[PDB]
Design an enzyme around this catalytic site. Sequence first.
Site, PDB file in Angstrom:
ATOM      1  CG  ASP A   1      -5.713  -4.440  -2.217  1.00 23.76           C
ATOM      2  OD1 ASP A   1      -5.753  -4.595  -1.081  1.00 23.76           O
ATOM      3  OD2 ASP A   1      -4.983  -4.890  -2.846  1.00 23.76           O
TER       4      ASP A   1
ATOM      5  CG  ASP B   1      -2.279  -1.028   0.914  1.00 28.99           C
ATOM      6  OD1 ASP B   1      -2.721  -1.125  -0.042  1.00 28.99           O
ATOM      7  OD2 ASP B   1      -2.414  -1.954   2.002  1.00 28.99           O
TER       8      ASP B   1
END
Length: 377
Positions: A149, A88
Amino acid sequence: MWQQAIGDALGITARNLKKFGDRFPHVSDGSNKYVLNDNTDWTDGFWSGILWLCYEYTGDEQYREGAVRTVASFRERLDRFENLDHHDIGFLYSLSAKAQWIVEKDESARKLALDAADVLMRRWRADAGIIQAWGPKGDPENGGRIIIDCLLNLPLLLWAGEQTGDPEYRRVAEAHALKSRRFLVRGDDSSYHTFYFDPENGNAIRGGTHQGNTDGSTWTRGQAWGIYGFALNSRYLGNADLLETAKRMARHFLARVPEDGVVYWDFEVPQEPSSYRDSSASAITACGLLEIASQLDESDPERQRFIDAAKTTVTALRDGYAERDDGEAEGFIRRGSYHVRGGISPDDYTIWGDYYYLEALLRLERGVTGYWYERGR
């Protein structure tokens, strides 16, 4: 048509900036108040992104100053490697440091984003041909696992590659995107949340999830990440196959939107009013639809169809989920859901939902496209 919606977001943000100080909002938990952190989660960049978007819309220095402070915080976070051993880094640094470079060409911020891209590059596992999403290298559990994601974390790498001329960034990003297309996306245009590969050779093992209802279900935010994610990679790579996949996933999503225009947390659970929703999935999709449309030929009829679908989605969010600036509410839209099966903030504000809702609004009202890539480029 969008001014009032943006106005409430602006007011809520200004209030929040003064209340939060240097801390970051993540999600709410049973109330109209955000739970804050000291830049230690995967969502801190969304706050920076919101601040930069407000600055671009208003020119109000209060937003810029808040955003600049978060960037300073991100430099400190990177230089002590605090909770960054995951994929991330893109969500975190594209929306903060890269964002500042995009907004005002700050060289220091550009450097920080480049430094961050380097750390993300070390998440690449050559033997498996994938970017490891979670856990330390070689983790028995997630050593060879990818998450959909992750597509939104590739923009940082792609941007860095174009900034440096180093072909490795694009090579790694393109390989991961293609592997994600073959194994995360399903034949009916739905998608798995995560997929497991053999860490030794990269061969496929199985698809599965921990945030969707079941391994074979369709977690709506996961589907949304696919829509926007494949579209963003499509732009950078000039890959028509990834754009096609974005379109396929978008159509699948649109055909399962309920009556009020905002999706439930998973498409494969009863689509009933007493069930949890995920306004963030709809917000992300609105942005993905507009991104897809921006890559289609003006003569393509589906282009205006996606644009109108995005508008319908944002209006649905505004009408039934948006908070008005009543001086108390700290979020833009209600009923997002973090981890339904885990019972973690299943009916709350999500800072990512708020960010995409505002990016969609900025796209529609000012043509401001966020911080996934350079403007006029």
